[PDB]
């Protein structure tokens, strides 16, 4: 289908499994506040052409 110059693939697909919600806890808040190397609350974005944040 072509709604307005936007071609669409013939196939159809959609996710079928939804994860259970995890309630926020005080230990999780402190872990976020620690700003550990693997769990920083900030994710950097990089320019595609020259790769700087």
């Amino acid at each position: 289908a072509n709604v307005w110059g936007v071609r669409l693939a013939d196939s159809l697909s959609s996710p079928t499994i939804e994860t259970r919600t995890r309630h926020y806890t005080l230990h999780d808040f402190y872990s976020d506040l620690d700003a550990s190397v693997g769990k920083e609350p900030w994710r950097p974005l990089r320019n595609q052409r020259t790769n700087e944040i």
Binding site: R20, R22, H23, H27
Partner: protein, 54 residues
């Protein structure tokens, strides 16, 4: 103070958790209390790192 006399031995910090094998005794408790305290003490909701089964 009915405690023995000795000095602690210093050990290097282990980077990874070590296996443990519990040993049981003659005392018994109701199952419901154990289940309730397991629920209370657990950190059960999280996302495990799924491994390769095969």
């Amino acid at each position: 103070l009915g405690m023995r006399i000795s000095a602690l031995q210093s050990l290097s910090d282990t980077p990874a958790p070590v296996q443990w094998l519990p040993q049981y005794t003659i005392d018994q408790v109701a199952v419901d209390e154990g289940d309730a305290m397991v629920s209370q003490l657990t950190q059960l909701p999280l996302r495990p790192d799924y491994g390769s089964i095969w």
